[PDB]
Every structure is written in C-alpha cells, then in structure tokens.
Design a protein around this ligand. Structure first.
Ligand SMILES: *C(=O)[C@H](CC(=O)O)NC(=O)c1cncc(-c2ccc(C(=O)O)cc2)c1
Ligand SMILES: *C(=O)[C@H](CC(=O)O)NC(=O)c1cncc(-c2ccc(C(=O)O)cc2)c1
Lengths: 140, 91, 91, 140
C-alpha cells in the first residue's frame, strides 16, 4: 500500500478562511476578487465530497482559536483535512484582518502528536498570499 | 512511530520571497488554476501531478499588465512543499 | 515567457528548522534511501513519486539511538520543494 | 507533452559537493559517513547516465566560484542539471569548510535569466544538511 486510504466514511473538512477587508492599521488594501476564489473553491471541494465551511474576515486571534477548535474535533471517520487560507502575508506569515500570524503557529495544532485523529492522514494547506515583495520579470 | 511533521502538504501560490497575483474579477491566478485542474484531473491524476499541471498553467498563461512599469509584465510560479508519505488520489 | 524561478526542484533531507541524521558507517538516512529508491524505480516511476517513497522509507524505517536522552529515539521527514512545470522521467 | 524532454544528447551534469572537514575556526565536527554517501550518489547518477563530478572540502568562496563557472558552461546538449550538497548548515544556509553560504546565492546562478542553456530544463538540488536544531520526537 503506497497511497493514502481514502475510503473512510467521509473525505473530511475543508476550512476556507477568506480575508477580504483589513483594518486601517494593517496598511493593507481590500483583496478584490477573493470572493470569486472562496466561491470557486467551495464548489470544487464540495464535488469531492468534502464538508466545506467558509469564514470571512477573521482576526488573527479568531484564526488561531478556530484552528485550535477544529483540531480538537474527532477526525476518526475522516480521510483527510484541507485548510485554504486567502489573505495578505509575508514569508511564513499570513494576515488576520487585524494583523499578522506566522503559519507555524496555526499549523502546529495539526502535527501527529497534537491531533491524533489525523495522524497518518494527509493534512493539506493551500495558501494564496504574498511571501514577500520580489517581482518575477520572466524570460524567453 | 512516524515523524510529527509528516503527512503535511503546503501548496503555496508563489515562490519564497515573491509577490502573488490576484485578478480583480477572476480571482487569484493560483486559485482559479488550482480549481480548474481539480475539476478535470481529480479523478485521473495523483495529487502531486495535479499540482504540477497547476504549476505549468500559472507560469505559462499569466502575466501582469499595469500602467506602472514596476508592476508591469510580471510572472509567477507556484511552490509545492510536500512532506507526504504516500500517493494521494481523490477517488 | 516564463518565471525565472520555475523549473527548480529542491529535495531537502529534512523539514524546516530540523536536524538531519547521518550514520557513521552507512551514511545519511536521506541519501541512502534516495539512492536505494532510485536504483529500484528510476526506470518505472515519475520523480515526485520516487521522492515520495524516499519520504516514507525515511519516516518509517529510521530512528536514532543514543545514550544521550536528548539524541535518542528521534525521527526525520524529508521535504520536497517543487516548482517543476512538467513530469520528470529518467527514461 | 506534460513530461520534460529527456532525449537530448546527454542527461547533464551532476555536481556533488562533499564537505567532510571544516576549519577549526568554524567549530564544526567532521561529517563521518559523508564519503559513503558521496560514492553511493556517484554510482547512482552514473547509472542514470549523468556526467558526475565530485568535489571535496570546498570553502564558501570556492563553492560560489564553482557554481558560477558551471552555469557559464554551455548546456545546450544537456537535458538537465543536478547538484548535490553534503555539509553542515541551518535554514536557508549550507556550510563551506570555512563558513556559511546562503543557499539563495548559489542557486541564483541557475535561474531562467542567468543561465539560458538550462532555461526550460529541470534543475535539481539535493541537500543533505541540517535546517536548524530541532529534533522530531515522533508519534504512534
Ligand atoms: C500580497 O500579499 C497579495 C496576495 C493576495 O492574494 O492578496 N497580493 C496583492 O496585494 C496583489 C495581487 N494582485 C494584484 C495586485 C496589484 C494591484 C494593483 C496593481 C496595479 O498595477 O495597479 C498591480 C498589482 C496586488
Ligand atoms: C547538521 O548540520 C548535520 C548535517 C549532516 O549531514 O551532517 N548533522 C550532524 O551533525 C549529525 C547528524 N547525525 C548524527 C550526528 C550525531 C553526532 C554525534 C552524536 C553523538 O552521540 O555524539 C550523535 C549524532 C550529527
């Protein structure tokens, strides 16, 4: 057996954190079109039998809390876990409407030792965010 | 016994240190591409190969247009960070 | 036109922030597994899949042993960082 | 075609930088076993038809210089490029016998715009180095 067991009762969760509007203090502009994403994703993962859940404009505190809570649920009947983040960011950092949070912190709630119901199961994290300011000119 | 950091897959929209492009009416390049590929290959290709298609699409069919030379004609390449132990199929 | 960061593939022996294990007589766990998997599948599997086996083997079959409680019973997981545009086959 | 073209005249280069002994000034210990790896790789890539070249105990300046030279070479008849690094190191860093060298620096020589003979060709980097001092305790 060299592929993940995907025949559990349910495919698993799909948390889509969609941050559009940021507090004046962050110095970030509204992310137009992000709703086209969150909508497009929702449908896509629904067709793959994932239980989808959308969240809009959550603060960095809310994001952490949400993760801590989802990682406390029992995933024994779930084949996998998918978490899509759409927001602003820098290298290793994503933005809550009111500020920055490093990925490490919200990812840790899911390691083999902290979230046992998902141990040995594929935990996917899709991230649409900037990782710095470098621009890629291209070639050819 | 397995590593705690194992079985994680981080699919980034762009390479380390770089900017990530979003279209005001169509959504980000990465997300619209990721969803298109899933729609066509979720029932045929293993996940890593699907993200590779996403990678080619973003790098091939997208470029920024701006009146500001600074942000004009810019390119993007997604970044697959896998720590998966096995092959992944959605079927 | 394509991104200047495209078509690179970094195969890390370990995960970000972690230590990597080398065996005094058999060499590093990462490299010995990579070579082993290459000898067996370079003529049959796509490179990302080959690297995925390297991942399982290292995560599964290895574990440190030491008299020092701190260096004892540790694990390791390789980290594949792909920005490849196409599927890679050595044949 | 969703697969790289590998039917060029030659598979390409496979540079193996193998650093075993470090300057007393760095305080790094000898990397016992590094030779077994170096030979293991040489054989493996030789069978895969790569033009393997080994190098041992290079300084940081030497590594940059070597990488700079390899990229100015013509790779038109080569299908790909492969560089293996065996040394000490931390996140985003690998050690020369005399000190650290940010990885970004040696890889930049090979991006699309800098090395046109390899544009559109697979540039593989295999790194056997520590990316920090963390130790994984395992689960299950
Ligand atoms: C950086 O964290 C974010 C990531 C995200 O997905 O939100 N990206 C942007 O802020 C971004 C993305 N796409 C386009 C633009 C932008 C806006 C205006 C111009 C212009 O030329 O006027 C160019 C680019 C910003
Ligand atoms: C960290 O930069 C390096 C990377 C490398 O490839 O050498 N790793 C080590 O230095 C390393 C890796 N595995 C084992 C050991 C080691 C050394 C001494 C003892 C001891 O008990 O004295 C245990 C393990 C070091």
């Amino acid at each position: 057996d060299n592929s993940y067991k995907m025949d559990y009762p349910e495919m698993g969760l799909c948390i889509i954190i969609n941050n559009k509007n940021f507090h004046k203090s962050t110095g970030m502009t509204s992310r137009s079109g992000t709703d086209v994403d969150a909508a497009n994703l929702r449908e896509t993962f629904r067709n793959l039998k994932y239980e989808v859940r959308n969240k809009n404009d959550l603060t960095r505190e809310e994001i952490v809390e949400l993760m801590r809570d989802v990682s406390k649920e029992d995933h024994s009947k779930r084949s996998s876990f998918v978490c899509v983040l759409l927001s602003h960011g820098e290298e290793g950092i994503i933005f809550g409407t009111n500020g920055p949070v490093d990925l490490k912190k919200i990812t840790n709630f899911f390691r083999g030792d902290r979230c046992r119901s998902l141990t040995g199961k594929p935990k996917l994290f899709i991230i649409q965010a900037c990782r710095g300011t470098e621009l890629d000119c291209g070639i050819e | 016994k397995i590593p705690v950091e194992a079985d994680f897959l981080y699919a980034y929209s762009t390479a380390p240190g770089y900017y990530s492009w979003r279209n005001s009416k169509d959504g980000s390049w990465f997300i619209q591409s990721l969803c298109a590929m899933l729609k066509q290959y979720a029932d045929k290709l293993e996940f890593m190969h699907i993200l590779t298609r996403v990678n080619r699409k973003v790098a091939t069919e997208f470029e920024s247009f701006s009146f500001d030379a600074t942000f004009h004609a810019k390119k993007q390449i997604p970044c697959i960070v896998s720590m998966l132990t096995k092959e992944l199929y959605f079927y």
